[PDB]
Design a protein around this motif. Structure first.
Motif, PDB file in Angstrom:
ATOM      1  N   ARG A  66      26.695  70.758  38.084  1.00  0.00           N
ATOM      2  CA  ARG A  66      25.370  70.388  38.571  1.00  0.00           C
ATOM      3  C   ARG A  66      25.002  71.184  39.818  1.00  0.00           C
ATOM      4  O   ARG A  66      25.649  71.056  40.858  1.00  0.00           O
ATOM      5  CB  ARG A  66      25.302  68.887  38.869  1.00  0.00           C
ATOM      6  N   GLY A  67      23.963  72.005  39.710  1.00  0.00           N
ATOM      7  CA  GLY A  67      23.524  72.823  40.826  1.00  0.00           C
ATOM      8  C   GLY A  67      22.827  72.027  41.912  1.00  0.00           C
ATOM      9  O   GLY A  67      22.266  70.963  41.652  1.00  0.00           O
ATOM     10  N   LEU A  68      22.858  72.554  43.133  1.00  0.00           N
ATOM     11  CA  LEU A  68      22.205  71.923  44.276  1.00  0.00           C
ATOM     12  C   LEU A  68      21.605  72.987  45.191  1.00  0.00           C
ATOM     13  O   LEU A  68      22.332  73.718  45.864  1.00  0.00           O
ATOM     14  CB  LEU A  68      23.191  71.052  45.059  1.00  0.00           C
ATOM     15  N   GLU A  69      20.279  73.071  45.212  1.00  0.00           N
ATOM     16  CA  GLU A  69      19.591  74.109  45.973  1.00  0.00           C
ATOM     17  C   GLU A  69      19.260  73.683  47.402  1.00  0.00           C
ATOM     18  O   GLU A  69      18.271  72.989  47.635  1.00  0.00           O
ATOM     19  CB  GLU A  69      18.308  74.528  45.253  1.00  0.00           C
ATOM     20  N   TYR A  98       7.381  66.377  52.985  1.00  0.00           N
ATOM     21  CA  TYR A  98       6.567  67.346  53.719  1.00  0.00           C
ATOM     22  C   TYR A  98       7.038  68.791  53.564  1.00  0.00           C
ATOM     23  O   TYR A  98       6.222  69.710  53.507  1.00  0.00           O
ATOM     24  CB  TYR A  98       6.537  66.990  55.208  1.00  0.00           C
ATOM     25  N   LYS A  99       8.352  68.985  53.478  1.00  0.00           N
ATOM     26  CA  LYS A  99       8.940  70.323  53.425  1.00  0.00           C
ATOM     27  C   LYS A  99      10.265  70.321  52.677  1.00  0.00           C
ATOM     28  O   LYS A  99      11.055  69.388  52.807  1.00  0.00           O
ATOM     29  CB  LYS A  99       9.174  70.881  54.835  1.00  0.00           C
ATOM     30  N   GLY A 100      10.523  71.381  51.919  1.00  0.00           N
ATOM     31  CA  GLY A 100      11.793  71.509  51.230  1.00  0.00           C
ATOM     32  C   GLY A 100      12.929  71.670  52.221  1.00  0.00           C
ATOM     33  O   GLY A 100      13.019  72.681  52.917  1.00  0.00           O
ATOM     34  N   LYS A 101      13.801  70.670  52.278  1.00  0.00           N
ATOM     35  CA  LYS A 101      14.952  70.686  53.178  1.00  0.00           C
ATOM     36  C   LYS A 101      16.115  69.926  52.557  1.00  0.00           C
ATOM     37  O   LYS A 101      15.913  68.979  51.796  1.00  0.00           O
ATOM     38  CB  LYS A 101      14.603  70.071  54.539  1.00  0.00           C
ATOM     39  N   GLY A 102      17.332  70.344  52.886  1.00  0.00           N
ATOM     40  CA  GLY A 102      18.519  69.655  52.414  1.00  0.00           C
ATOM     41  C   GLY A 102      18.746  69.805  50.924  1.00  0.00           C
ATOM     42  O   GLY A 102      18.302  70.775  50.309  1.00  0.00           O
ATOM     43  N   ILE A 103      19.450  68.836  50.348  1.00  0.00           N
ATOM     44  CA  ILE A 103      19.769  68.843  48.927  1.00  0.00           C
ATOM     45  C   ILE A 103      18.510  68.773  48.063  1.00  0.00           C
ATOM     46  O   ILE A 103      17.576  68.032  48.371  1.00  0.00           O
ATOM     47  CB  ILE A 103      20.699  67.665  48.568  1.00  0.00           C
ATOM     48  N   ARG A 104      18.493  69.549  46.984  1.00  0.00           N
ATOM     49  CA  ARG A 104      17.394  69.526  46.029  1.00  0.00           C
ATOM     50  C   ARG A 104      17.874  69.990  44.659  1.00  0.00           C
ATOM     51  O   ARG A 104      18.493  71.047  44.536  1.00  0.00           O
ATOM     52  CB  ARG A 104      16.238  70.404  46.513  1.00  0.00           C
ATOM     53  N   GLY A 108      16.112  72.610  38.439  1.00  0.00           N
ATOM     54  CA  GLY A 108      14.963  72.603  39.325  1.00  0.00           C
ATOM     55  C   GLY A 108      14.241  71.272  39.328  1.00  0.00           C
ATOM     56  O   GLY A 108      14.302  70.518  38.357  1.00  0.00           O
ATOM     57  N   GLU A 109      13.551  70.982  40.427  1.00  0.00           N
ATOM     58  CA  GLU A 109      12.778  69.753  40.548  1.00  0.00           C
ATOM     59  C   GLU A 109      11.669  69.954  41.575  1.00  0.00           C
ATOM     60  O   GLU A 109      11.865  70.630  42.585  1.00  0.00           O
ATOM     61  CB  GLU A 109      13.694  68.583  40.936  1.00  0.00           C
ATOM     62  N   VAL A 110      10.505  69.367  41.316  1.00  0.00           N
ATOM     63  CA  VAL A 110       9.359  69.535  42.201  1.00  0.00           C
ATOM     64  C   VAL A 110       9.182  68.337  43.128  1.00  0.00           C
ATOM     65  O   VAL A 110       8.676  67.291  42.719  1.00  0.00           O
ATOM     66  CB  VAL A 110       8.056  69.752  41.403  1.00  0.00           C
ATOM     67  N   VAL A 111       9.620  68.488  44.375  1.00  0.00           N
ATOM     68  CA  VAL A 111       9.369  67.480  45.396  1.00  0.00           C
ATOM     69  C   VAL A 111       7.865  67.410  45.643  1.00  0.00           C
ATOM     70  O   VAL A 111       7.189  68.439  45.645  1.00  0.00           O
ATOM     71  CB  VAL A 111      10.116  67.801  46.708  1.00  0.00           C
ATOM     72  N   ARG A 112       7.342  66.203  45.842  1.00  0.00           N
ATOM     73  CA  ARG A 112       5.907  66.020  46.024  1.00  0.00           C
ATOM     74  C   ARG A 112       5.400  66.751  47.263  1.00  0.00           C
ATOM     75  O   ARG A 112       5.996  66.661  48.335  1.00  0.00           O
ATOM     76  CB  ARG A 112       5.569  64.532  46.123  1.00  0.00           C
ATOM     77  N   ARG A 113       4.296  67.474  47.105  1.00  0.00           N
ATOM     78  CA  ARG A 113       3.687  68.193  48.216  1.00  0.00           C
ATOM     79  C   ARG A 113       2.999  67.229  49.178  1.00  0.00           C
ATOM     80  O   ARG A 113       2.409  66.237  48.755  1.00  0.00           O
ATOM     81  CB  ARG A 113       2.687  69.228  47.693  1.00  0.00           C
ATOM     82  N   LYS A 114       3.069  67.534  50.471  1.00  0.00           N
ATOM     83  CA  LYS A 114       2.399  66.740  51.495  1.00  0.00           C
ATOM     84  C   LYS A 114       1.695  67.656  52.489  1.00  0.00           C
ATOM     85  O   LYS A 114       2.178  68.748  52.787  1.00  0.00           O
ATOM     86  CB  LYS A 114       3.393  65.835  52.229  1.00  0.00           C
ATOM     87  N   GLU A 115       0.552  67.209  53.000  1.00  0.00           N
ATOM     88  CA  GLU A 115      -0.210  67.998  53.958  1.00  0.00           C
ATOM     89  C   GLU A 115      -0.124  67.406  55.360  1.00  0.00           C
ATOM     90  O   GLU A 115      -0.628  66.312  55.614  1.00  0.00           O
ATOM     91  CB  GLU A 115      -1.672  68.104  53.522  1.00  0.00           C
TER      92      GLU A 115
END
Lengths: 133, 175, 123, 138, 36
Positions: free
Chosen positions: B85-88, B157-163, B166-173
């Motif tokens: 299992r990959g972890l980006e 808010y921002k791509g950080k840490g484990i992810r 592929g997976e799309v974390v919800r975008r925040k402004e």
RNA sequence: AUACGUUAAGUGGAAAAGGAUGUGGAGUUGCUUAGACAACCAGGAUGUUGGCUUAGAAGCAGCCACCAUUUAAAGAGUGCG
């Protein structure tokens, strides 16, 4: 591929074209002479032009007809159609006049047949509220 | 239209013992497993083909019957192809490197992060971004994947840490 | 199920008068790729050509029971049947072959169809 | 908001509800209508709360039907007053209600919109209710 | 959120009981809900 | 105790409006081995955002005539944009 409505009679200043195609790697100086060439047959009109983008920075362009239903206002003889189509039949046009219009749109239309090209225009004439006679 | 009625071929070489009651000691080059099974289920071994059958159409049995096949298929594949299992990781100063069997994680916390893999599991670090947890046990590899994720919950808010890749974390402004 | 009969009886009428046909896989069937073929039909003829992807073994193969009994082997997986009405055969075998070579949909290495009693090798 | 132009008596007995409704059990003026499962008092304000809820969601459409006009006053003695020393005064009005009665009706409305307008009315009304349609044997 | 009358808000929402308590779950975090 | 069942929460051994792929029965109906619900691989409409508009906003300011063709298929539009 970025479509744009470059005017037939002019092609040089940055604000209409400029960076928007200049970031595509397009050599603006070499194509502006080409826009003024073939489009000279229909000067004074705003001609849309598709722009494919090859990896080798080679380019080939395809010109198109002026936008549809604008001609319908001319055949009707009225400057503007009803804001309430069918409910208000302000204008009428003969079916034979429609044949003159559909032929002009043929290079733009994807229609398989002239008889089908008629039916395509018929859906536009109804938008103006114009009766088909 | 149903789960457990489907046959499961054994590519090989995977032997399957039928010891009561009921323990299934799958064996092979990669490892071994012994899934628990209550007596009501009926496992049988066709030649190079595992099989499962339902004692009755009752709703409780309908649920358990579809689970037993999915587990055995997870078991054989881990004894063969294995799992990972990959972890980006995403960020700037974030990085990771092993120190012995232990996996040090330079997470943005001032406190150093370390996670010890359980036996039968190893974690190579081909790159500072990607993380791969190889293992024969899907229940364990997904558990370790969760435990590593626990170190840093993702920020919308921002791509950080484990992810997950592929997976799309919800975008925040922000503002 | 009456609507399904219209799917069957009509296409058979074409096959009784059909001349030539070619295998076409449905994978990656981009709409733009279809239009490039449809324009070619406009040159060869009009509506007379048929694309109909009704390629179920329970569907088109039953139509083949009367004539063209070579479709049984081609029946598995994706298919895009084509039928001719008039039009002396020539480019129709060639035009689709040119398309697949330039990307756009797998040709299936041309499984082939009725012409004599053969399969592979477009001419 | 509906009140009588005149009433023969300022006050009346509260009464004792029982049994099936005397009539009006079958909707027919409208394509669909709410039907109470039980029986309970309904204040005039509760009726107005229902009709306002429908007029917004319905937008353009047929007129709302109201089979039920309130007629029975509910006595309301002023607070902290001791028991007896005369009957109180009618603060408002309450229609008599019986189980199976058609509380409201709607017509000329599409099937999807009709399901909602009957539903919002069901919440304003304490009595449990169910969807109903016209019968035509007939 | 926790309300006695949990309901779906959008098509993405799904009703799933858990531990004797019904919970609606959705790709949007705001729509997540549990009764009781 | 016997026989047919039901219930899983300690309901039984505390109420309500309302909410729910809880479960046991009964009925009606759509589709369905000339092919169903799940999928996993295919594509997404053509003139066109089309009329009336708001700086421009083209599937989408919103009000709609919301047309007909390409056809294996797609609304001049289900939706996140």
């Amino acid at each position: 591929v970025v479509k744009l409505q470059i005017p037939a009679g002019k092609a040089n200043p940055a604000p209409p074209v400029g960076p928007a195609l200049g970031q595509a790697g397009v050599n603006i100086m070499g194509f502006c002479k080409e826009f003024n060439a073939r489009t000279a047959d229909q000067a004074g009109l705003i001609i849309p032009v598709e722009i494919s983008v090859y990896e080798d920075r080679s380019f080939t362009f395809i010109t198109k007809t002026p936008p549809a239903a604008v001609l319908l206002k001319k055949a009707a003889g009225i400057e503007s159609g009803s804001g309430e189509p069918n409910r208000n039949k302000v204008a009428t046009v003969k079916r034979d006049k429609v044949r003159e219009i559909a032929e002009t749109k043929m290079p733009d239309l994807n229609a398989a047949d002239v008889e089908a090209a008629m039916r395509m225009v018929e859906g536009t004439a109804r938008s103006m509220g114009i009766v088909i006679e | 239209s149903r789960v457990g009625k489907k046959l499961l071929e054994i590519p090989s070489d995977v032997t399957v013992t039928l010891n009561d009651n009921n323990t299934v000691a799958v064996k092979g080059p990669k490892g071994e497993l012994t899934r628990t099974f209550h007596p009501d289920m009926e496992i049988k071994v066709e030649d190079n083909v595992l099989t499962v059958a339902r004692p009755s159409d009752q709703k409780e049995h309908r649920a358990l019957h579809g689970t037993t096949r999915s587990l055995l298929g997870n078991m054989v594949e881990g004894v063969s192809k294995g799992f990972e299992r990959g972890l980006e990781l995403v960020g700037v100063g974030y990085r990771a490197s092993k120190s012995g069997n232990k996996l040090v994680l330079n997470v943005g916390y001032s406190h150093p992060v370390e996670i010890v893999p359980e036996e039968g599991i190893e974690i190579e670090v081909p790159s500072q971004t990607k993380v791969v947890v190889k293992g024969t046990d899907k229940e364990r590899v997904g558990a370790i994947a969760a435990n590593i994720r626990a170190v840093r919950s993702p920020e919308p808010y921002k791509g950080k840490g484990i992810r997950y890749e592929g997976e799309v974390v919800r975008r925040k402004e922000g503002k | 199920a009456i609507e399904t009969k219209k799917v069957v009886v009509e296409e058979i009428a074409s096959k009784l008068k059909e001349s030539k046909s070619t295998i076409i896989v449905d994978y990656r069937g981009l709409n733009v790729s279809e239009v490039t073929e449809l324009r070619k039909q406009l040159r060869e003829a009009n509506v007379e050509f048929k694309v109909y992807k009704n390629t179920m073994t329970r569907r088109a193969v039953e139509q083949a029971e009367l004539n063209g009994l070579n479709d049984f082997l081609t029946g598995p997986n994706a298919i895009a049947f084509s039928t001719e009405d008039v039009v002396a055969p020539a480019k129709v075998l060639n035009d689709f072959a040119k398309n697949h070579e330039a990307l756009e949909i797998k040709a299936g290495v041309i499984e082939g169809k009725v012409s004599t009693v053969e399969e592979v090798k477009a001419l | 908001m509906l009140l009588p132009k005149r009433v023969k008596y300022r006050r009346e007995h509260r009464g004792k509800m029982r049994g099936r409704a005397k009539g009006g059990t079958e909707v027919h003026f409208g394509e669909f209508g709410i039907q109470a499962l039980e029986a309970s008092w309904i204040t005039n304000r509760q009726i107005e709360a229902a009709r306002i809820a429908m007029t917004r969601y319905m937008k353009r459409g047929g007129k709302v039907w109201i089979k039920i006009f309130p007629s029975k006053p509910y006595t309301a003695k002023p607070l902290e007053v001791r028991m007896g020393s005369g009957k109180g005064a009618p603060e408002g009005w309450v229609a008599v209600v019986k189980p199976g009665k058609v509380l409201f009706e709607i017509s000329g409305v599409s099937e999807e919109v009709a399901r909602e307008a009957l539903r919002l009315a069901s919440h304003k009304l304490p009595i449990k209710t169910k969807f109903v349609k016209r019968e035509e044997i007939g | 959120k926790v309300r006695p009358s949990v309901k779906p808000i959008c098509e993405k929402c799904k009703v799933i009981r858990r531990k004797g308590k019904v919970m609606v779950i959705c790709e949007n975090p705001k729509h997540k809900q549990k009764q009781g």
